């Protein structure tokens, strides 16, 4: 056993499963807004000799010795992150160690808040994330609600926008120490200038979780949260086309300068943030993942990346206009970013039966809740997004053909409803019936023939 | 931009740093007990197309659709883990989702304990881990002590072994709900049969964190914690030679069978453990890391792996016998596993000055606390281990030559003490003085010439 | 030393102070709504041989022995309490052990709520009590907010009534486990039927703290909280004319009868309430105070007591009509119970300067906050009440003369404002100036001559 | 209804029960150590016109007005308390507002400790109080353990004394923020000089709860806790012969004077203690109870009170010597204060059957736990004390006759054991059997004839 043997020989069983996954991605359409293909150059650094390194601490304060090369890699990633967002090093910092986005959020609450403190964020059914705090009627589901106190704020049902008026009303009576400003299923741009006024009145920190729109802020196509914020957490695997990891930004320097005589009150975010990640919550950083992020951040400072972000917006407005002509209703009347929310209630079909029938035609999409929903098990909407098919060099003319396959698949779903009853009898009718299963076969063949003719970023067989 | 470009062309700067790290590993000796080189077959699966997949939940209960191939990969990793340790599937389970070892521990406390509950584990200065709970005199350093209550137990100063007598005395007065049985700097085998009796008396769960000895239990060279335990957490990157990840085991089935008439009280660990990882603490699993673990677990069920574990023990006893002949004192009088603790107090040199001078000769070792230590900044011991050099096909005859370089480096450190005073004046004397720096150069050349002639597992340039 | 010596001989110094207090009460007017004179028969039982008894527990479950007589006294007080409010013994219980009203509230939170649970009650500036939860902007002032989580609800500024619409809005987003329905500075009757609907929607307990209106509910002059409530706490020294103590009521019996087949789900308030008082929070009951309460509760089941409560209402409406004719503004436009709130802002004088000048004329009244108040140190209102002067056989014709002394004292306060500036210069102008101090002397002589001609309940010199 | 009617006329039923209690006290023997008769002069101030006063706050900082006389009464009680214990006003303070002893303890924890802090005190089965923290195996019984964390320390089984060696061992591993030094069933003097060293090592406050020995410290017969303590809580109704209330002492002034240059670090106990009582935990003080305490504290500064405390000690040593001659075993071999612990195990009778048979002969005594007790429902000891019979002018010659009635009652209890089995069959044999019930009648007549010839402090019929 030398340890230098290829996977094709040592483990034949695992090598076969690794190829079936690559074939599944190249023959189907990907409409999920939280997925994006990764570059080959980043994958070569994700699996290298850096996995065999065990360092603990921060550059210049290592525990063990011999960490001379990894210090230059971590200090290099901290300079490419402050330049991709055009930040001033003397006024901002960055921490490139959290394992993912969810660990990045818990490290912010532990650093700035005592246990059982009050936090306020967007509600989950209305387009917020689970890490912002979530409770059921009989159980605490999220860890943020187990160790802290949470209270949500909701939207305006008749417009679909965030209700800033009611937010300022309940904030004075609840008085939270932290307010979160981030969404995961929202089609409009958040008004950061208004949420800053609510925080200055009740005296609280403002956290901006921009994990979904992180790739658009770097290309300067939408206004940046950094203008009115104190802490900014983001992921590196959503719209940045990088390896899975996390990032944390914080301000540093003078705060309320000139309060009396010649005083200079400074920010105190730097020390508390670094201590919460290590040695409190985490152990040894994944040095291989940090190197893959530095490769992706360098690609975000190029003219090519700006032309990619401009196409993500044009591919979303082209898909939204095509749906309205077919006879559909969009939540909030349109879109301003990279995703489109659909409302299928006028069509007479729910999002649960539509998501299933599209899965058999190799079209991936997830159901979404709508403001007028009586039952949660059958949402009446879908959530579509354009960041992953754009990587395969899709254009506006190609996105209009995707709608033709979607509208044709919904019509097949409106025939099964006229013959079945319960949803459990809907899934079993798409298989045992030879008539419905034959029409589904003629549609799957036309989708795979169309999607297989586009380039796929990555390697070439795994 | 096609996305299929090699790292040598797209990012020349990052490619140069990736080669300097590979050269540093092949020319130096590695004596840290928490490091081990990884196979090439595992690294090829760590960086593949599985990074571009976003699944949430567990097999058969996915959120989105299209997760047909990744379900077979996750179910395959759950069968290779129960077979590497010769477990019965009807009596044990496994969870292969935690990001690392530290997240694996916090997911156990959140599932079985309410906030501000009592936990008892080994003290950090005495050979325990930071995730078991640790507090300073003025501050809470570990997250386990921030969200839960902790109280440690200590060793016997005059023997170096765990004091089981005092453990049963303070357990009746503190009455903890959970007891941890795991070490990170211990040279003997823990007595699990005795710690089980303490848990049955005060009625508490027993957790066995075997992250350090996980590779020896699989080869059946030392007794297994599974015989007297309920939960077992371990890492996959210490002695298993795999990618960085985590594992959690739990019992299932009947518990106190036949309590009355024909009752069968079952275990209730399965549901609470799975819910604590998702959706409470974590988000999307790293599917690429899970595939690399299944490649490494398959290598642990082979006759070749047993011959490797037998050599790890013989290489430790050979290094321990060589140190006693040179005139040294070992903590607890010897070793029974993969590491050796040294006591340099009779030699007149501390572990802080010894760790530094060895770093200049490309010999990596970390200082360790000793039972009679007045100051914590200058520990009087070292922690040496044999699992990584054994991967490069080292033998007993080669480990005796490593001691010749260690004993020769300590003698150089005993000359600087006769000329300097404060430790800050010790680091600056090894550089500016041309006489001491020249003798250090003649020793570094002989170490690199010796260590470069052994095979290195991995790829061949990165 | 025999121990049977009168206070006039053994302690001459304390006997002189005990007579100066009795003279101060008989020569001045008492307008505080939280005070009432006590009967002589109750005071004779407050200081007897029952002070020399040490029992612990509840009747039939005593710790020590010999508690044969005190069991009949405690069981007698539990029957007179259920009869004064016309309660059914098979559907209600009572606990006659809390030391006062504040201890009675904390014993309810500890029995039905875990630590750090959510409670909602009326805000302190708006007419609620401090034991319902209160927090400053920089500090937690009340013990209810230190051990539990609280969030208040407010009034309608333009009407002065409780805003039930906003209460149901914030209750769905905060979801409290307990809602309190009690006031200490409110002139209207609370709508218990509406607050019951808010509790049935979010599933929470309803607590009715009726410490202020406890004497009116017993006489059946206002609707009783018992019709829509689960727990009722009250004091025995506000409008019941008894010794200082506390009471706790709770329902018992079937709850949601007939849920399935022949099930009968019962109430579980009885055991948890009794355990929270003893042995959790308190020690040995004050048996002398319990005997004085049984004497006062027997007087509340008489026709004489109903004629007293009818006069308390007529004496309040007569005082309110007299103030409007003089040129004053009442909060909420009038009164429906035993107190009257005044608004002095149109008159050009604040409540801080008015409360002080009335104290020099032996007229006791406390300032009250008004909805349009910029500064909290100078409230613009007063709080007047009629339960204590009614005990001295005051009538409507006599209450109209009290307003003549109040309106004459305010006019003296409007002259000092034209000569002074800061409030600290207002207090010092009422003493050093011989002209203002002489006019104050001619008014004090006319008040004491009028108030000294009415009977005073109690003894006759102490 | 004038309100000036005697209790004999207005409430004939309550007046009859008030006389049966006075007759029960004058015809029986009282051996409980937590009871003592009260002076007539104190009872006259307990029930006066001060009950009809509602003040809130502290002297000089009242809420309402007109509190001119009660300020001189509260300031007078604060001077008699600092003089009864010979304290320096410039170095000590006092708070005379807590309702009883149990509320006095909770006000100390809330002022100096955050929620869920660590406290250590004597265990309940071993002679400590319930307010020091107590937990069962399945439930939290005390409120101190619900809001704070507690861990007890125990005695030495083979000597009966406090084990100071084990206390210093577990204190370093638990590290509590507060240590309590007070007992309720202990026959020896606590070593305060040793417990002070344990607090200086782990840096913690020392609380001295001297509720039982408060009357002996004032007479200078035993060493005072004030020499080595920071906070001292006590009751006024145990050995001080006063009304039921509470007291809290605290140090003030310079602490670690001269730490650097000319610094003077002061104590910070004054502000935090006063805020915890009001407005946090309590409401309106019972002014009638405060006046009765000032009458009792004045009697403690007299030569007559010292002669009373000297007789309490001589009456305990005389009762202890008489028990050893009869053939009994005393816990810890004797007594040093006001109580005597007995061990009935050699006699073959338990404390449960002995306490019952003595109750039928009008001899009151409570059972006590012994170090070798397998079952808690049948303790093998009794707790006897001498502070209440000494008030009736008992002497050493009279206490020897009490033992003759005790030893004669135990012999009657040793006959029923030879005829019955279960304890439930023991209680029913003392009534239905005419032979055992007749011998009990001849003994009760001789006790009442003897105890009725001694003076009883108080009034003369109630």
Curated annotation (Swiss-Prot), chains A, B, C, D:
Q: Give cofactor(s), names only.
A: pyridoxal 5'-phosphate
Activity regulation information from UniProt: Hydroxymethyltransferase is inhibited by succinylation at Lys-238.
Q: Which UniProt keywords apply?
A: Acetylation, Cardiomyopathy, Cytoplasm, Disease variant, Intellectual disability, Membrane, Mitochondrion, Mitochondrion inner membrane, Mitochondrion nucleoid, Nucleus, One-carbon metabolism, Phosphoprotein, Pyridoxal phosphate, Transferase, Transit peptide
Which GO molecular-function terms appear in the entry? Answer: amino acid binding; chromatin binding; glycine hydroxymethyltransferase activity; identical protein binding; L-allo-threonine aldolase activity; pyridoxal phosphate binding
Identify residues that carry Phosphoserine.
428
Pfam families given in the database record: SHMT
Q: Name one GO cellular component term.
A: BRISC complex
Give the consequence of mutating residue 238 to Q: Abolishes pyridoxal phosphate-binding, leading to oxidative phosphorylation deficiency
Q: Where in the cell is it found?
A: Mitochondrion; Mitochondrion matrix, Mitochondrion nucleoid; Mitochondrion inner membrane; Cytoplasm
Protein family according to the UniProt entry: Belongs to the SHMT family.
Query: What is this protein's function per UniProt?
Result: Catalyzes the cleavage of serine to glycine accompanied with the production of 5,10-methylenetetrahydrofolate, an essential intermediate for purine biosynthesis. Serine provides the major source of folate one-carbon in cells by catalyzing the transfer of one carbon from serine to tetrahydrofolate. Contributes to the de novo mitochondrial thymidylate biosynthesis pathway via its role in glycine and tetrahydrofolate metabolism: thymidylate biosynthesis is required to prevent uracil accumulation in mtDNA.
Record's protein name: Serine hydroxymethyltransferase, mitochondrial
Q: Which organism is it from?
A: Homo sapiens (Human)
